[PDB]
Protein backbone atom coordinates (compact mmCIF):
# COMPACT_ATOMS: atom_id res chain seq x y z
CA UNK A 1 0.00 0.00 0.00
CA UNK A 2 1.17 3.14 -0.83
CA UNK A 3 0.24 4.63 2.60
CA UNK A 4 2.46 2.74 4.59
CA UNK A 5 5.64 3.57 2.13
CA UNK A 6 4.59 7.58 2.94
CA UNK A 7 4.05 7.17 6.62
CA UNK A 8 7.24 5.28 7.29
CA UNK A 9 9.14 6.41 4.66
CA UNK A 10 9.98 10.09 2.94
CA UNK A 11 11.14 10.71 -0.47
CA UNK A 12 14.97 10.74 -1.10
CA UNK A 13 15.20 14.24 -2.67
CA UNK A 14 14.39 15.88 0.91
CA UNK A 15 17.08 14.40 2.06
CA UNK A 16 19.44 15.37 -1.01
CA UNK A 17 18.65 18.93 -0.82
CA UNK A 18 19.04 21.48 1.43
CA UNK A 19 18.19 21.43 5.29
CA UNK A 20 18.17 25.07 6.62
CA UNK A 21 15.56 27.53 5.00
CA UNK A 22 15.02 31.00 5.05
CA UNK A 23 11.80 33.31 5.57
CA UNK A 24 10.70 36.22 4.58
CA UNK A 25 10.05 40.45 6.18
CA UNK A 26 5.95 40.27 6.13
CA UNK A 27 4.62 38.67 9.75
CA UNK A 28 4.37 40.92 12.52
CA UNK A 29 8.17 41.66 12.87
CA UNK A 30 9.93 37.95 13.33
CA UNK A 31 12.86 37.26 16.08
CA UNK A 32 16.07 35.32 15.94
CA UNK A 33 14.49 32.17 16.17
CA UNK A 34 12.27 32.84 12.92
CA UNK A 35 15.06 34.49 10.73
CA UNK A 36 17.07 30.89 9.88
CA UNK A 37 15.04 27.74 10.61
CA UNK A 38 14.79 24.12 9.16
CA UNK A 39 12.65 23.23 6.60
CA UNK A 40 9.15 21.55 7.83
CA UNK A 41 9.15 19.50 5.14
CA UNK A 42 12.58 17.99 6.33
CA UNK A 43 12.35 18.17 10.01
CA UNK A 44 11.10 14.99 11.31
CA UNK A 45 10.23 14.10 15.08
CA UNK B 1 0.96 13.25 35.09
CA UNK B 2 2.36 15.59 32.43
CA UNK B 3 3.90 14.01 29.50
CA UNK B 4 4.75 17.10 27.26
CA UNK B 5 4.40 20.86 27.04
CA UNK B 6 3.92 23.01 23.88
CA UNK B 7 3.47 26.79 22.31
CA UNK B 8 1.80 27.51 19.75
CA UNK B 9 3.62 28.97 16.52
CA UNK B 10 3.80 32.69 15.15
CA UNK B 11 3.86 30.96 11.82
CA UNK B 12 0.60 29.80 10.06
CA UNK B 13 -0.20 28.65 7.34
CA UNK B 14 -3.45 27.12 6.08
CA UNK B 15 -3.69 23.89 5.77
CA UNK B 16 -6.57 23.20 3.36
CA UNK B 17 -6.43 19.69 4.28
CA UNK B 18 -9.50 17.44 2.50
CA UNK B 19 -10.00 14.29 5.27
CA UNK B 20 -11.31 11.56 3.57
CA UNK B 21 -12.72 8.76 5.94
CA UNK B 22 -11.50 5.85 4.24
CA UNK B 23 -14.00 3.31 4.04
CA UNK B 24 -12.15 0.36 4.69
CA UNK B 25 -15.28 -0.95 6.58
CA UNK B 26 -18.46 -0.20 4.61
CA UNK B 27 -21.63 -0.37 6.88
CA UNK B 28 -24.81 -2.13 6.57
CA UNK B 29 -27.34 -0.46 3.96
CA UNK B 30 -29.72 1.73 4.83
CA UNK B 31 -33.33 -0.59 4.92
CA UNK B 32 -36.77 0.81 6.15
CA UNK B 33 -41.94 16.04 6.35
CA UNK C 1 3.57 81.26 18.20
CA UNK C 2 5.59 80.45 21.31
CA UNK C 3 9.01 81.56 19.61
CA UNK C 4 8.31 85.28 19.87
CA UNK C 5 7.01 84.98 23.22
CA UNK C 6 10.48 82.99 24.23
CA UNK C 7 12.71 85.59 22.65
CA UNK C 8 10.49 88.42 24.31
CA UNK C 9 10.73 86.29 27.81
CA UNK C 10 14.92 85.57 27.26
CA UNK C 11 14.98 89.53 26.09
CA UNK C 12 13.17 90.86 29.61
CA UNK C 13 16.04 88.04 31.15
CA UNK C 14 18.78 89.75 29.31
CA UNK C 15 18.02 93.35 30.42
CA UNK C 16 17.24 92.19 33.95
CA UNK C 17 21.26 90.32 33.78
CA UNK C 18 22.50 93.38 32.47
CA UNK C 19 20.93 95.67 35.37
CA UNK C 20 22.66 93.01 37.61
CA UNK C 21 25.95 92.96 35.15
CA UNK C 22 28.17 94.94 36.55
CA UNK C 23 28.69 93.73 40.69
CA UNK C 24 29.87 90.46 38.63
CA UNK C 25 32.83 90.07 41.52
CA UNK C 26 30.71 88.59 43.99
CA UNK C 27 30.51 84.89 44.80
CA UNK C 28 27.05 84.88 45.91
CA UNK C 29 25.86 86.90 42.45
CA UNK C 30 28.15 84.74 40.73
CA UNK C 31 26.02 81.11 41.88
CA UNK C 32 22.65 83.28 41.40
CA UNK C 33 24.09 84.16 37.97
CA UNK C 34 24.78 80.75 36.90
CA UNK C 35 22.34 78.97 38.20
CA UNK C 36 20.13 81.25 36.78
CA UNK C 37 21.91 80.56 33.23
CA UNK C 38 22.06 76.82 34.04
CA UNK C 39 18.50 76.37 34.44
CA UNK C 40 17.63 78.70 31.61
CA UNK C 41 20.04 77.49 28.43
CA UNK C 42 18.56 73.94 29.55
CA UNK C 43 15.01 75.20 29.26
CA UNK C 44 15.80 76.96 26.11
CA UNK C 45 17.54 74.23 24.41
CA UNK C 46 14.66 71.23 24.91
CA UNK C 47 11.79 73.90 24.27
CA UNK C 48 12.67 74.41 20.34
CA UNK C 49 10.13 74.15 17.95
CA UNK C 50 9.76 72.45 14.48
CA UNK C 51 9.14 74.95 11.85
CA UNK C 52 12.96 75.15 10.65
CA UNK C 53 13.68 71.41 9.27
CA UNK C 54 10.59 71.01 7.00
CA UNK C 55 12.41 71.46 3.17
CA UNK C 56 10.88 71.32 -0.23
CA UNK C 57 14.07 68.96 -0.80
CA UNK C 58 13.36 66.55 2.61
CA UNK C 59 12.21 63.35 1.51
CA UNK C 60 9.79 60.97 3.32
CA UNK C 61 12.97 59.23 5.06
CA UNK C 62 14.26 62.52 5.79
CA UNK C 63 11.09 63.95 7.40
CA UNK C 64 10.56 60.74 9.64
CA UNK C 65 14.09 61.27 10.66
CA UNK C 66 13.46 65.00 11.57
CA UNK C 67 10.10 64.03 13.76
CA UNK C 68 12.04 61.14 14.73
CA UNK C 69 15.04 63.41 16.50
CA UNK C 70 12.42 66.22 17.60
CA UNK C 71 10.77 62.56 19.72
CA UNK C 72 14.03 61.86 20.79
CA UNK C 73 15.52 65.23 22.45
CA UNK C 74 11.85 67.05 22.69
CA UNK C 75 8.90 65.53 24.72
CA UNK C 76 8.08 67.28 27.21
CA UNK C 77 5.02 69.60 25.88
CA UNK C 78 5.09 68.32 22.01
CA UNK C 79 2.91 65.57 22.52
CA UNK C 80 1.08 65.40 18.94
CA UNK C 81 4.05 64.90 17.06
CA UNK C 82 2.97 61.01 17.54
CA UNK C 83 0.04 61.69 16.34
CA UNK C 84 1.52 62.86 13.04
CA UNK C 85 4.25 60.14 12.77
CA UNK C 86 1.31 57.70 12.94
CA UNK C 87 -0.86 59.49 10.09
CA UNK C 88 2.64 60.62 8.15
CA UNK C 89 3.12 56.77 7.48
CA UNK C 90 0.53 55.79 6.52
CA UNK C 91 1.25 58.44 3.21
CA UNK C 92 4.62 56.91 2.78
CA UNK C 93 3.55 53.11 2.63
CA UNK C 94 4.90 52.97 -0.92
CA UNK C 95 8.28 55.37 -0.23
CA UNK C 96 8.77 53.16 3.05
CA UNK C 97 9.40 49.81 0.83
CA UNK C 98 12.36 51.52 -1.26
CA UNK C 99 15.26 52.16 1.25
CA UNK C 100 15.20 48.73 2.99
CA UNK C 101 16.72 45.12 2.68
CA UNK C 102 16.40 41.86 2.77
CA UNK C 103 15.79 40.30 6.36
CA UNK C 104 18.64 37.29 6.46
CA UNK C 105 21.08 39.96 5.83
CA UNK C 106 20.46 43.44 6.79
CA UNK C 107 21.26 42.55 10.14
CA UNK C 108 25.26 41.92 9.48
CA UNK C 109 24.98 45.39 8.14
CA UNK C 110 27.57 48.37 9.64
CA UNK C 111 25.74 50.52 11.41
CA UNK C 112 22.62 49.07 11.65
CA UNK C 113 23.23 48.02 15.04
CA UNK C 114 22.98 51.98 16.14
CA UNK C 115 19.98 52.87 13.68
CA UNK C 116 17.67 49.02 14.74
CA UNK C 117 15.58 51.29 17.29
CA UNK C 118 14.79 54.23 14.99
CA UNK C 119 14.10 51.58 12.34
CA UNK C 120 12.10 49.45 14.69
CA UNK C 121 10.10 52.53 16.08
CA UNK C 122 9.50 53.84 12.59
CA UNK C 123 8.25 50.54 11.22
CA UNK C 124 5.89 49.83 14.08
CA UNK C 125 3.92 53.06 14.15
CA UNK C 126 4.16 54.29 17.30
CA UNK C 127 7.08 56.38 18.26
CA UNK C 128 6.34 55.13 22.08
CA UNK C 129 7.13 52.08 21.17
CA UNK C 130 9.95 49.72 22.94
CA UNK C 131 12.48 47.45 21.17
CA UNK C 132 12.96 45.30 24.15
CA UNK C 133 12.00 41.93 22.47
CA UNK C 134 14.64 42.07 19.91
CA UNK C 135 12.73 41.65 17.10
CA UNK C 136 14.08 41.63 13.34
CA UNK C 137 12.44 44.09 11.03
CA UNK C 138 13.35 45.03 7.29
CA UNK C 139 17.08 46.67 7.54
CA UNK C 140 17.27 50.43 6.20
CA UNK C 141 19.69 50.28 3.34
CA UNK C 142 22.73 52.46 4.53
CA UNK C 143 24.07 52.40 1.14
CA UNK C 144 25.41 55.81 -0.36
CA UNK C 145 23.52 54.86 -3.62
CA UNK C 146 20.33 54.20 -1.92
CA UNK C 147 20.88 56.95 0.64
CA UNK C 148 21.73 60.47 -2.30
CA UNK C 149 17.85 58.69 -4.00
CA UNK C 150 15.94 58.48 -0.68
CA UNK C 151 17.50 61.14 1.51
CA UNK C 152 19.51 65.07 1.11
CA UNK C 153 22.79 64.86 2.08
CA UNK C 154 22.11 68.04 4.83
CA UNK C 155 20.44 66.18 7.23
CA UNK C 156 22.45 63.47 7.84
CA UNK D 1 38.84 40.29 34.85
CA UNK D 2 36.32 37.54 33.54
CA UNK D 3 38.85 37.62 30.47
CA UNK D 4 35.74 38.04 27.92
CA UNK D 5 32.97 40.76 27.69
CA UNK D 6 30.33 37.72 27.13
CA UNK D 7 31.20 35.89 29.85
CA UNK D 8 30.81 39.11 31.81
CA UNK D 9 27.27 39.67 30.17
CA UNK D 10 26.64 36.33 30.77
CA UNK D 11 27.31 36.02 34.44
CA UNK D 12 25.74 39.24 35.20
CA UNK D 13 22.71 37.92 33.45
CA UNK D 14 21.83 35.44 36.45
CA UNK D 15 18.69 36.95 37.32
CA UNK D 16 15.51 35.05 37.96
CA UNK D 17 14.61 32.81 34.41
CA UNK D 18 17.88 32.23 32.66
CA UNK D 19 17.13 33.48 29.01
CA UNK D 20 14.98 36.91 29.17
CA UNK D 21 15.15 37.27 24.87
CA UNK D 22 14.20 33.80 24.48
CA UNK D 23 11.07 34.12 26.13
CA UNK D 24 9.89 37.48 24.71
CA UNK D 25 10.63 35.80 20.69
CA UNK D 26 8.27 33.22 21.68
CA UNK D 27 9.44 30.41 19.71
CA UNK D 28 12.31 17.96 15.51
CA UNK D 29 15.53 16.50 13.85
CA UNK D 30 16.44 16.79 10.32
CA UNK D 31 15.17 13.64 8.61
CA UNK D 32 18.47 12.37 6.64
CA UNK D 33 19.69 12.50 10.45
CA UNK D 34 17.14 9.97 11.78
CA UNK D 35 17.60 7.97 8.97
CA UNK D 36 21.71 7.69 9.57
CA UNK D 37 20.43 6.77 12.99
CA UNK D 38 18.35 3.91 11.71
CA UNK D 39 21.23 2.55 9.54
CA UNK D 40 23.69 2.81 11.80
CA UNK D 41 21.67 0.97 14.11
CA UNK D 42 20.83 -1.97 12.48
CA UNK D 43 24.16 -1.90 10.76
CA UNK D 44 25.74 -2.27 14.29
Known amino acids: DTSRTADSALVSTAFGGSVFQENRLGETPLCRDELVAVAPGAAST | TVVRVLRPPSTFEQDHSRLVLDEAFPTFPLYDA | ?156 | ?44
Open chain 4, 1 to 44: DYGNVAFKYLALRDDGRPLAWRRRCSGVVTTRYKAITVAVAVCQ
Open chain 3, 1 to 156: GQQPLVRRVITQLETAATEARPYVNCRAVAELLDLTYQRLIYWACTLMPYVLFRRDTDTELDTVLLMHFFYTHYRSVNGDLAVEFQNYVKNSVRHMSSFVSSDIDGDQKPGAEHMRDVSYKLFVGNLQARDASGLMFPIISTRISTVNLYLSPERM
